[PDB]
Amino acid sequence: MEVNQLGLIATALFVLVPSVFLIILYVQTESQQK
Amino acid sequence: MEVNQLGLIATALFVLVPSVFLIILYVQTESQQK
Amino acid sequence: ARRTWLGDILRPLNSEYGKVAPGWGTTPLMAVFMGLFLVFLLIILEIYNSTLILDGVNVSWKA
Amino acid sequence: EPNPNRQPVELNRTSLYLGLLLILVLALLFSSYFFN
Amino acid sequence: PIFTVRWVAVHTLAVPTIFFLGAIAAMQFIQR
Amino acid sequence: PLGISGTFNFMIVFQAEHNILMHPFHQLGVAGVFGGALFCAMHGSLVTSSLIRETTETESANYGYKFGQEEETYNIVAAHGYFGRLIFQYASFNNSRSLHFFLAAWPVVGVWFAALGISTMAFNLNGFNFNHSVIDAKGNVINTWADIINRANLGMEVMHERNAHNFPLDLA
Amino acid sequence: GLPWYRVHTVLINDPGRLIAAHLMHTALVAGWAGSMALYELATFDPSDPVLNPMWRQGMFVLPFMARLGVTGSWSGWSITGETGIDPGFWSFEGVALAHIVLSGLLFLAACWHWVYWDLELFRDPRTGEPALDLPKMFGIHLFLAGLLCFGFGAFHLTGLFGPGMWVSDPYGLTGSVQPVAPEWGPDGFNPYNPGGVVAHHIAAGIVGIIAGLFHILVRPPQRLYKALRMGNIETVLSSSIAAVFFAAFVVAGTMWYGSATTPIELFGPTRYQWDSSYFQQEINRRVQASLASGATLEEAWSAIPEKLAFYDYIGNNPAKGGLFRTGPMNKGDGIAQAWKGHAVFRNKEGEELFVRRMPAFFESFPVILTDKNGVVKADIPFRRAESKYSFEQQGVTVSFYGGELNGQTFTDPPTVKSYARKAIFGEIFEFDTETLNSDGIFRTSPRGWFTFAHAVFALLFFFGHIWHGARTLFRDVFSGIDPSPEQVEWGFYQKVGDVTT
Amino acid sequence: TITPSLKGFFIGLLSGAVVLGLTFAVLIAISQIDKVQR
Amino acid sequence: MMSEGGRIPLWIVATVAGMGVIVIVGLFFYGAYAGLGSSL
Amino acid sequence: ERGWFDILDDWLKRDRFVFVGWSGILLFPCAYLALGGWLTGTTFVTSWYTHGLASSYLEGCNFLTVAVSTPANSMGHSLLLLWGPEAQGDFTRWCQLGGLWTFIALHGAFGLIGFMLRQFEIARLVGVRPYNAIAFSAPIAVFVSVFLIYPLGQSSWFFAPSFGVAAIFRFLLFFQGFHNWTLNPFHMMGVAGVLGGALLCAIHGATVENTLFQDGEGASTFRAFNPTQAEETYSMVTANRFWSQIFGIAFSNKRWLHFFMLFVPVTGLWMSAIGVVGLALNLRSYDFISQEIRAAEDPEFETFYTKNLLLNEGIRAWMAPQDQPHENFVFPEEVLPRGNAL
Amino acid sequence: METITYVFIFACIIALFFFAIFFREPPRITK
Amino acid sequence: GERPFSDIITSVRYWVIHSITIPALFIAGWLFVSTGLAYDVFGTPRPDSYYAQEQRSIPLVTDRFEAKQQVETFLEQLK
Ligand code: CLA
Ligand code: CLA
Ligand code: CLA
Ligand code: CLA
Ligand code: CLA
Ligand SMILES: CC1=C(/C=C/C(C)=C/C=C/C(C)=C/C=C/C=C(C)/C=C/C=C(C)/C=C/C2=C(C)CCCC2(C)C)C(C)(C)CCC1
Ligand SMILES: CC1=C(/C=C/C(C)=C/C=C/C(C)=C/C=C/C=C(C)/C=C/C=C(C)/C=C/C2=C(C)CCCC2(C)C)C(C)(C)CCC1
Ligand SMILES: CC1=C(/C=C/C(C)=C/C=C/C(C)=C/C=C/C=C(C)/C=C/C=C(C)/C=C/C2=C(C)CCCC2(C)C)C(C)(C)CCC1
Ligand SMILES: CCCCCCCS[C@@H]1O[C@H](CO)[C@@H](O)[C@H](O)[C@H]1O
Ligand SMILES: [Ca+2]
Ligand SMILES: [Cl-]
Ligand SMILES: [Cl-]
Ligand SMILES: [Fe+2]
Ligand SMILES: [Mg+2]
């Protein structure tokens, strides 16, 4: 199928950038003094 | 220039994935009871 | 620690940690197997390498 | 009851900077070959 | 005679070295 | 040129025009940078080998040194004990000042000679030329590896700046 | 806390979680295999095993499935080109699905083992400390390994209970999966003899069973237990990594040189077949035999199978690629369509001339034609002003025998020269360069990629062996050296590192 | 049949065994003479 | 012929040895220009 | 009462001028034979029958031009054992066939294994951590990939490096012309580690020598150090301040500094080895496809990348007939690529 | 797209130099 | 445990031994070349043994297993 060639990178970053934002915030919350 | 259409996604993920791994680790080190 | 049915069955197989035969035990026999292994590897290498050429052994796609 | 084999993990600031330098410089080197 | 590891080491190198240097010296007088 | 492939262009044309591989100052350069790298790895491994135990198993040993502490952080006697036995006793440094001087001097001198190689090939005093140096009883040339080098250099020579030369000799 | 490069050390003293990590690794590998196969099946064109076989298409797992007897698709085709087959469940798709399901079960098993790490099995009855009896584990695992090796050789490869393995003629024309009998004489050690693979597995399997029984029943000598630190699991990591880099070098080697386990219809021809003109010789043999039996030239060449001609072409040589030229071979020269036929070059005198072929080393190569005695008769000049051997001066023509162009003769010098440029690559093919937007630049086959990855990983695994061996043997000083100046200095001890001297 | 290269192989093996056998006999003999008191 | 060190001063050994080296290496250089390897 | 193995062990591990060890049993003979094989072949042995080359002092070569050359391409990857089927026990014929090449490669490989075992054995005896041995993995990776893996992927040992100064220079130029090896990012990482290592070597030795504490009255400052002193002989604090202010960053941790000195050149050599493993298969970074598509369509488009391939093409055409004599190349004058005039 | 990618990476590296120098972990004598 | 090289090499005993063995080995190596024996042990051509008088093609080995005979044959072709 003749898809937009930027579809892949747009989709990849759309997932990765905010997912990683959340993961960074979750992990440093867990590592805070129990 | 007729570059490989996967070169952009490859470079972006090459940068992003390990960099994010280090950022996760650094920020959760900083948030540890100092 | 948690006992289980399968864990109980397997117990004997993980019960002799640290146990040894006295001194050198079967080391000498092991040495001989190692030497024979070394010689076997040398033979298969030299056959592949055509350093050792044997009757009825044509090391080729073709016979 | 908790696993006593657990340990905290650390990456100090200098190691972050060293690491990001490694990653970005490797990307700067390899990206040409990726695009080809 | 009593030989040492050091003495053996020294002579495995030194002895051929001199022999070779004599060989090479002689080669400087070969003409085609 | 100020560029990665342009640097390689420079190097290849320089070989064609100066046979720099066969020049002893470039040879000293190589000894300086290979030697620099060998002694870098050497010194690093020797000091790392002999760090004094100051940390637990779950910690980086680097935490056993505090910036500005007075005491040395490794045992140079132990380092020397290892290296002196690796080669023989007197091949090893136990004066850290002599050691660090050598680490400075070896790559620095080598690289001075590399610089002077380029700076003297600049005035066309070029690498050793043993092209057809070996001749048989009749007069036939017996090639050596120098002559094979010379065939590679010719290829570079005849191809470079393919539109720039109108006359038979490349004189600069 | 732990630096990033040590995070996994938390498993050293935790057998249940180590198992969970191993299960997760195993789930990942099996998921990879299932995923890879499904992707290959989504991209593979099964319609031409002659000029578009798997190894032209960048297939990596498909040949491993074919090597052991999975040759069929549920959709009805086989890799040998058959229609109407029923492969049963064990088609390429069934194998993929089975690996995906395995992956999921392993994943669920990993979770269970992770949570229920504190099993009484993992503790020393006497000390209550986590304990694994590694010497006996080694016997158990070796014995199981022996059984499976034996069974694999005696049942699967023989066809006795299983499908056999891939075998072919010496020119890779008629490959298929067949039952293979063990070879028990010295030809069993011939890498190109598939019966030796069968006898290996039977014999090495029986030996693994016997030694595993030994290793189950007999304790290590105190001397070896101490020297090899057999209470330290990292000793096993060290020697297992060594065994694996040995195996990895071996498989890179037999992939590159060829063996009965690296058949050319699955992985492509080897570079040495081009080097030795192996296919050209057999082609010329056949053609000569036809001419001697009375054939015309047209008939002799027309009797050459297209598949045999295609092996005698450099775009199929695995030593003609590039590290960043990615994907299938079809992406470079194109999807091969048809043999054009054998080109015969002749000068104005009618003498037959031969194009000097490109050696694998050369990215480009001049066009030079010599008579049968090696004397140069024509070429394509670079400088023209002093040309003596031009196609135009020498009246060079080309005629084809066999293939698409059978019976045709070209005399227009640009055309004759274009075919001569193709002839440096061996036999001449028509390609579809449009379907994949092919760029004309050669790529390696799965033979090349496999060898590369395995030689590289084997070398890197040498570092891992050295590193873990050292950590095993110097565990006491891993955090640094003792905070006796007479043990490092000279003169004091007679024997190094011994205070009793 | 014992081909020329199999005889060659045996010559190579015997040679290596001799080199190793001589090396170890000599080293064992020397170490037994020349001993560390403790 | 005693085994005692110091009887032939180290400085003379080193001078004579070094002169020996200069001679042998100088002969090698002379040979670069005569006979084999001379290009003539 | 003590067993023979323990008695041999005692004797192997005696503190003597030249430490022996169990490792010595492998190292000494193999290292001696490798070095002695090289000296012997470069002094006395020709390359006429393998290469059509003179390669010994005896034939008139000098230190730069002598080599022990690889065997003829027709020998393939034969071990070329003295007692093997090629030489068949004949020492003279063995030399003429190139048997000293595999002699030296294989003894050199087993000798490198012995040297690294020695590094381990000594470290264990003296009680230091075995980083020096770990660092030596890099020379080993370079030797194995270049002298063994590389020719094993090619047609034969003929294409391995020959052991000699000029022969090695020829190997460099072959890799430029045929492999475009300078374009390879694995080579480039190797370059970075070797030049980076020489950088660290120089800068560290110079920094120590210029931040020394005054610990004596001499203008020559070497005497004012004692191996046993507890105190650092130079100021880490002043050195850190100097480099922080000159270069923006500085080491503050001495242990990290020394580990990094190991890491840099060791990692570089390992990365270069990987690239050579690719070149064994001709898996080069030879080209950039986008460059070639543009240049093919556009005869005014030129970069330093296309300029270098023209040099490579020269190298291959001009060197191949003498460098690969088994090919029997005859390239008529008219087919040789050449620019104008030259 | 390639030019953007190369300039982006380069720009990030320069940004890193700035943080590594001006926002380094400050060296402190344990005192 | 053993004497410093600097003691050994400054002693008369050392020089008495080595004033004879050093020249002896040097002269043995000289003669090894001057009598031509070096050529025959190693199989290195003399200046007059690279080519037969008229030919100009090199005696390259082309057959792995009778390379020994090929060399023997090339050597007979020099009259
Ligand atoms: C009749 C009984 C029988 C028969 C017919 C066979 C037949 C075979 N065996 Mg099996 N074997 C048997 C019994 C048998 N075996 C038994 C009882 C055991 C003991 C458990 C083994 C253990 C064994 C091993 C360990 C190997 C074989 C191999 C083979 C194959 C040799 C052909 C080949 O391709 O080698 C190719 C392999 C070699 C020529 C060996 C190379 C050795 C290297 C050079 C050692 C040095 C390695 C070092 C890491 C290299 C670093 C340097 C390098 C990078 C340059 C062939 C299938 C080999 C195989 O699997 O090949 C695919 C192999 O490695 N066998
Ligand atoms: C053993 C591993 C292996 C091998 C030999 C192959 C082989 C093949 N695959 Mg498969 N593959 C693999 C694993 C492998 N694959 C894995 C794990 C995946 C999931 C990602 C895939 C997914 C995949 C897809 C999606 C496709 C292939 C295709 C192919 C073919 C073309 C390969 C190619 O172009 O490579 C090109 C290889 C490179 C450009 C080399 C990369 C080198 C890296 C980037 C170096 C990094 C250096 C490092 C960062 C340095 C750090 C330094 C530091 C330590 C200091 C070939 C048959 C293609 C095909 O034709 O399918 C039909 C295809 O489309 N493969
Ligand atoms: C079966 C093989 C195997 C196993 C089980 C281990 C396991 C171990 N290693 Mg060893 N090692 C191996 C092979 C292996 N290694 C190899 C081949 C090398 C050379 C490359 C090493 C070199 C090595 C060093 C130098 C060190 C270890 C350390 C460790 C320990 C901590 C690992 C960790 O936390 O990393 C955590 C890793 C990460 C968080 C990220 C790694 C990211 C990598 C670099 C790139 C991504 C890889 C990709 C995801 C997976 C594809 C793999 C496939 C192609 C093989 C652990 C016991 C460390 C140690 O001893 O601790 C005390 C240590 O310092 N290993
Ligand atoms: C640089 C090479 C090298 C070095 C320094 C080491 C170092 C180490 N090894 Mg490893 N190893 C190596 C390569 C090496 N190894 C190779 C190639 C293999 C085969 C795959 C192994 C297999 C191995 C195992 C299985 C184990 C070690 C272990 C060890 C450790 C203890 C010492 C030891 O057992 O040495 C081993 C001795 C050698 C490598 C010397 C081998 C000398 C051979 C016998 C000479 C053969 C000559 C040959 C027949 C000539 C014919 C050639 C032919 C081509 C014609 C130490 C970390 C042990 C460990 O980690 O303990 C905690 C351990 O269990 N090694
Ligand atoms: C540790 C010392 C050591 C090692 C590891 C090597 C290793 C090697 N040598 Mg070197 N060598 C050495 C010391 C060593 N050598 C010394 C001291 C000398 C001078 C005497 C030589 C002189 C020499 C020559 C002249 C040549 C070699 C060659 C070789 C290679 C092939 C060896 C081989 O196939 O052996 C095979 C032998 C063994 C593997 C020994 C096996 C021992 C087993 C375990 C016991 C079997 C005994 C058995 C019961 C009795 C024999 C059976 C009977 C039928 C005869 C290999 C690289 C060859 C080479 O380099 O060619 C390119 C070659 O031509 N070596
Ligand atoms: C859960 C479950 C399930 C499901 C499952 C599944 C669905 C799975 C899947 C899985 C998968 C689907 C997986 C995958 C995997 C993959 C992987 C793991 C990959 C990897 C990769 C890598 C590692 C790479 C690397 C690289 C790169 C990237 C580049 C080049 C170089 C290299 C090669 C290195 C079921 C229902 C069954 C049931 C039970 C439960
Ligand atoms: C010791 C030593 C060494 C060695 C050295 C040497 C070997 C030296 C030599 C030296 C010498 C051997 C010197 C000489 C000198 C001389 C002189 C300085 C002279 C002068 C002269 C003159 C001035 C003259 C003049 C004249 C004229 C002008 C004219 C005519 C007359 C006459 C001749 C008089 C070494 C380094 C090893 C080490 C350390 C120590
Ligand atoms: C191969 C072989 C073998 C062995 C042999 C040997 C072991 C030999 C040795 C040899 C040797 C061991 C030789 C040596 C030589 C030496 C020389 C030839 C030297 C020279 C030197 C010089 C000339 C010096 C120079 C210089 C320098 C270096 C720097 C400073 C300055 C001067 C200039 C002084 C055997 C019988 C087992 C068997 C078969 C084969
Ligand atoms: C050098 C090869 C290494 C193999 C190690 C074998 C040493 S085993 C040998 O066995 C005897 C009987 O059990 C003991 O009495 C003796 O002390 C011991 O040296
Ligand atoms: Ca197109
Ligand atoms: Cl240019
Ligand atoms: Cl001009
Ligand atoms: Fe230092
Ligand atoms: Mg001369």
mmCIF file with all atom_site columns, N, CA, C and O in Angstrom, chain J residues 302-317:
data_model
loop_
_atom_site.group_PDB
_atom_site.id
_atom_site.type_symbol
_atom_site.label_atom_id
_atom_site.label_alt_id
_atom_site.label_comp_id
_atom_site.label_asym_id
_atom_site.label_entity_id
_atom_site.label_seq_id
_atom_site.pdbx_PDB_ins_code
_atom_site.Cartn_x
_atom_site.Cartn_y
_atom_site.Cartn_z
_atom_site.occupancy
_atom_site.B_iso_or_equiv
_atom_site.pdbx_formal_charge
_atom_site.auth_seq_id
_atom_site.auth_comp_id
_atom_site.auth_asym_id
_atom_site.auth_atom_id
_atom_site.pdbx_PDB_model_num
ATOM 1  N N  . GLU J 1 302 ? 29.988 16.201 -7.713  1.00 0.00 ? 302 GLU J N  1
ATOM 2  C CA . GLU J 1 302 ? 31.280 15.602 -7.304  1.00 0.00 ? 302 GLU J CA 1
ATOM 3  C C  . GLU J 1 302 ? 31.521 15.812 -5.812  1.00 0.00 ? 302 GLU J C  1
ATOM 4  O O  . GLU J 1 302 ? 31.191 16.893 -5.304  1.00 0.00 ? 302 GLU J O  1
ATOM 5  N N  . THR J 1 303 ? 31.945 14.750 -5.112  1.00 0.00 ? 303 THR J N  1
ATOM 6  C CA . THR J 1 303 ? 32.310 14.908 -3.681  1.00 0.00 ? 303 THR J CA 1
ATOM 7  C C  . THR J 1 303 ? 33.674 14.296 -3.392  1.00 0.00 ? 303 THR J C  1
ATOM 8  O O  . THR J 1 303 ? 34.291 13.625 -4.246  1.00 0.00 ? 303 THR J O  1
ATOM 9  N N  . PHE J 1 304 ? 34.167 14.467 -2.167  1.00 0.00 ? 304 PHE J N  1
ATOM 10 C CA . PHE J 1 304 ? 35.439 13.799 -1.894  1.00 0.00 ? 304 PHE J CA 1
ATOM 11 C C  . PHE J 1 304 ? 35.265 12.270 -1.914  1.00 0.00 ? 304 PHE J C  1
ATOM 12 O O  . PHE J 1 304 ? 36.214 11.515 -2.147  1.00 0.00 ? 304 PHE J O  1
ATOM 13 N N  . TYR J 1 305 ? 34.056 11.834 -1.637  1.00 0.00 ? 305 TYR J N  1
ATOM 14 C CA . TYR J 1 305 ? 33.735 10.390 -1.686  1.00 0.00 ? 305 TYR J CA 1
ATOM 15 C C  . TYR J 1 305 ? 33.921 9.834  -3.136  1.00 0.00 ? 305 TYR J C  1
ATOM 16 O O  . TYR J 1 305 ? 34.531 8.749  -3.320  1.00 0.00 ? 305 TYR J O  1
ATOM 17 N N  . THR J 1 306 ? 33.377 10.524 -4.142  1.00 0.00 ? 306 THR J N  1
ATOM 18 C CA . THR J 1 306 ? 33.550 10.000 -5.523  1.00 0.00 ? 306 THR J CA 1
ATOM 19 C C  . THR J 1 306 ? 35.039 10.142 -5.915  1.00 0.00 ? 306 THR J C  1
ATOM 20 O O  . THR J 1 306 ? 35.544 9.311  -6.644  1.00 0.00 ? 306 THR J O  1
ATOM 21 N N  . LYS J 1 307 ? 35.720 11.246 -5.501  1.00 0.00 ? 307 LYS J N  1
ATOM 22 C CA . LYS J 1 307 ? 37.143 11.453 -5.804  1.00 0.00 ? 307 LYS J CA 1
ATOM 23 C C  . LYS J 1 307 ? 37.954 10.262 -5.292  1.00 0.00 ? 307 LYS J C  1
ATOM 24 O O  . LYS J 1 307 ? 38.851 9.783  -6.003  1.00 0.00 ? 307 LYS J O  1
ATOM 25 N N  . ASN J 1 308 ? 37.653 9.780  -4.075  1.00 0.00 ? 308 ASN J N  1
ATOM 26 C CA . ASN J 1 308 ? 38.380 8.577  -3.522  1.00 0.00 ? 308 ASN J CA 1
ATOM 27 C C  . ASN J 1 308 ? 38.148 7.269  -4.238  1.00 0.00 ? 308 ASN J C  1
ATOM 28 O O  . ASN J 1 308 ? 39.051 6.433  -4.327  1.00 0.00 ? 308 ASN J O  1
ATOM 29 N N  . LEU J 1 309 ? 36.928 7.044  -4.723  1.00 0.00 ? 309 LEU J N  1
ATOM 30 C CA . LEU J 1 309 ? 36.720 5.814  -5.475  1.00 0.00 ? 309 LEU J CA 1
ATOM 31 C C  . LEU J 1 309 ? 37.568 5.851  -6.770  1.00 0.00 ? 309 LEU J C  1
ATOM 32 O O  . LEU J 1 309 ? 38.104 4.831  -7.181  1.00 0.00 ? 309 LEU J O  1
ATOM 33 N N  . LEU J 1 310 ? 37.740 7.024  -7.395  1.00 0.00 ? 310 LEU J N  1
ATOM 34 C CA . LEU J 1 310 ? 38.574 7.062  -8.617  1.00 0.00 ? 310 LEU J CA 1
ATOM 35 C C  . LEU J 1 310 ? 40.003 6.605  -8.237  1.00 0.00 ? 310 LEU J C  1
ATOM 36 O O  . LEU J 1 310 ? 40.644 5.867  -8.961  1.00 0.00 ? 310 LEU J O  1
ATOM 37 N N  . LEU J 1 311 ? 40.503 7.054  -7.080  1.00 0.00 ? 311 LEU J N  1
ATOM 38 C CA . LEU J 1 311 ? 41.832 6.613  -6.618  1.00 0.00 ? 311 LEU J CA 1
ATOM 39 C C  . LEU J 1 311 ? 41.832 5.120  -6.373  1.00 0.00 ? 311 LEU J C  1
ATOM 40 O O  . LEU J 1 311 ? 42.824 4.407  -6.722  1.00 0.00 ? 311 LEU J O  1
ATOM 41 N N  . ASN J 1 312 ? 40.779 4.641  -5.741  1.00 0.00 ? 312 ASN J N  1
ATOM 42 C CA . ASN J 1 312 ? 40.695 3.156  -5.525  1.00 0.00 ? 312 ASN J CA 1
ATOM 43 C C  . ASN J 1 312 ? 40.747 2.352  -6.827  1.00 0.00 ? 312 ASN J C  1
ATOM 44 O O  . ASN J 1 312 ? 41.351 1.255  -6.887  1.00 0.00 ? 312 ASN J O  1
ATOM 45 N N  . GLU J 1 313 ? 39.997 2.811  -7.822  1.00 0.00 ? 313 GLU J N  1
ATOM 46 C CA . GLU J 1 313 ? 39.988 2.155  -9.126  1.00 0.00 ? 313 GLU J CA 1
ATOM 47 C C  . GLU J 1 313 ? 41.401 2.143  -9.747  1.00 0.00 ? 313 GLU J C  1
ATOM 48 O O  . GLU J 1 313 ? 41.792 1.146  -10.364 1.00 0.00 ? 313 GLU J O  1
ATOM 49 N N  . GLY J 1 314 ? 42.137 3.251  -9.623  1.00 0.00 ? 314 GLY J N  1
ATOM 50 C CA . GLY J 1 314 ? 43.542 3.283  -10.016 1.00 0.00 ? 314 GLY J CA 1
ATOM 51 C C  . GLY J 1 314 ? 44.339 2.246  -9.278  1.00 0.00 ? 314 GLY J C  1
ATOM 52 O O  . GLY J 1 314 ? 45.093 1.462  -9.886  1.00 0.00 ? 314 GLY J O  1
ATOM 53 N N  . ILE J 1 315 ? 44.231 2.262  -7.946  1.00 0.00 ? 315 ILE J N  1
ATOM 54 C CA . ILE J 1 315 ? 44.969 1.295  -7.179  1.00 0.00 ? 315 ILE J CA 1
ATOM 55 C C  . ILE J 1 315 ? 44.666 -0.113 -7.673  1.00 0.00 ? 315 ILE J C  1
ATOM 56 O O  . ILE J 1 315 ? 45.613 -0.892 -7.893  1.00 0.00 ? 315 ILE J O  1
ATOM 57 N N  . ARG J 1 316 ? 43.408 -0.483 -7.859  1.00 0.00 ? 316 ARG J N  1
ATOM 58 C CA . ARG J 1 316 ? 43.129 -1.902 -8.196  1.00 0.00 ? 316 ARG J CA 1
ATOM 59 C C  . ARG J 1 316 ? 43.727 -2.276 -9.552  1.00 0.00 ? 316 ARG J C  1
ATOM 60 O O  . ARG J 1 316 ? 44.316 -3.388 -9.690  1.00 0.00 ? 316 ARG J O  1
ATOM 61 N N  . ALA J 1 317 ? 43.610 -1.364 -10.529 1.00 0.00 ? 317 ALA J N  1
ATOM 62 C CA . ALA J 1 317 ? 44.016 -1.720 -11.899 1.00 0.00 ? 317 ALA J CA 1
ATOM 63 C C  . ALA J 1 317 ? 45.553 -1.768 -12.032 1.00 0.00 ? 317 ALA J C  1
ATOM 64 O O  . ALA J 1 317 ? 46.134 -2.623 -12.778 1.00 0.00 ? 317 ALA J O  1
#
